[PDB]
Amino acid sequence: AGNATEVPANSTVLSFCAFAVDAAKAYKDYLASGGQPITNCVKMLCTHTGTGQAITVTPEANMDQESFGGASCCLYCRCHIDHPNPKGFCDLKGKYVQIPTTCANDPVGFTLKNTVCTVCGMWKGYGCSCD
């Protein structure tokens, strides 16, 4: 009974981050020790003529990005653990995340390490035009 949500390639990393006191540090340390990035993310088929904003209500990938379902790019959603913000709610689940094509191999790691510019809505270092 029930419906499988995961693949065996993610068992080790999800189990490791599911038990950690600091899941974010655990995942970065897992990658640093040669571990593979979390796979089975929700990658979107899109026109690639989108605005290029980081977190959107519809896929907004441009020619330099890949669009993904937001919950699938969130380590806390992927591990079914508490979210680090004081309210305990997610900012990626329910939205689409645009990830640079060069970082599309590790969408979970990208969202953990990067910040969205509050002024232009693009990722800092990956499309943020202002200083």
Partner: protein, 285 residues
């Protein structure tokens, strides 16, 4: 090829919306095309769902520098025999709003302690994962008729994990700088550990130089077995699965080959006692 780890145990006849599904596998079929998913404006997100996620299938085979391994070799467990605590859990089945996973009910230890927990699960919602009480039924059978009254005599997990830390601290402070849980078919016990164990790099006690065996969420602090008062988590525990030592049959039949003083009362603590007993007889004779 799929795993049972994080299996969705809800009875919802549809998958999830692309923005809410944790994985490609969990996205509803309407959105799938050519190995990918599509956004369909007009088919909205669900804002009321409650989906029980299964904690059966953890695999602790990580190789990360600075992080100790939970499962140790037989030779390392022998060296730390003073840290041995037999551990067994009798679980109940998810029912009504969910089906397909087991939840901890009676946690038994070789110290003779039994703790009853309120059947609690990890329930995905549009916003987060909600650790909360779920509808559960005791296993279908007559050897599990002792579990029926326990479905109402359970404690919330915030109290249960405090009592486990308290019992381990009282037992092990004068014996060891660690805990080694001695298991038989570790699967459900490892699942149960998600409810009271945390892992990370080796730490020291806040009040002394001894290694940290406990962790407190409330204060974000670490403690040894001597200073763990009020602590809620077991930190960096060790363990071993006695079943994997080449045994042919079940726990009781292998235990009874060497020992005749531990009868089966059919309770979780009894299996935990028999596990540690068998481990001692096998390792030291």
């Amino acid at each position: 090829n799929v795993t049972g780890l994080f299996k969705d145990c809800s009875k919802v006849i549809t998958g999830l919306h692309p923005t809410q599904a944790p994985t490609h596998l969990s996205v509803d079929t309407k959105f799938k095309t050519e190995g990918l998913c599509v956004d369909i404006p007009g088919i909205p997100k669900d804002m009321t769902y409650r989906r029980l996620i299964s904690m059966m299938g953890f695999k602790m085979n990580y190789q990360v520098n600075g992080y100790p391994n939970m499962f140790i070799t037989r030779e390392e467990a022998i060296r730390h025999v003073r840290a041995w605590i037999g551990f067994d859990v009798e679980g109940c089945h998810a029912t009504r709003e969910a089906v397909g996973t087991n939840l901890p009910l009676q946690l038994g230890f070789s110290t003779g302690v039994n703790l009853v927990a309120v059947p609690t699960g990890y329930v995905d919602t549009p916003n987060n994962t909600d650790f909360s009480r779920v509808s559960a039924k005791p296993p279908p059978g007559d050897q599990f008729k002792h579990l029926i009254p326990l479905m109402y005599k359970g404690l919330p997990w915030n109290v249960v994990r405090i009592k486990i830390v308290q019992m381990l601290s009282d037992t092990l402070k004068n014996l060891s700088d660690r805990v080694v849980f001695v298991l038989w078919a570790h699967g459900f016990e490892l699942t149960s550990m998600k409810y009271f164990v945390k892992i990370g790099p080796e730490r020291t006690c806040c009040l002394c130089d001894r290694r940290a065996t406990c962790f407190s969420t409330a204060s974000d602090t670490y403690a040894c077995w001597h200073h763990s008062i009020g602590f809620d988590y077991v930190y960096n525990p060790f363990m071993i699965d006695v079943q994997q030592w080449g045994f042919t049959g079940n726990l009781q039949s292998n235990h009874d080959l060497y020992c005749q003083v531990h009868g089966n009362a059919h309770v979780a603590s009894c299996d935990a006692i028999m596990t540690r007993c068998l481990a001692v007889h096998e390792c030291f004779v």
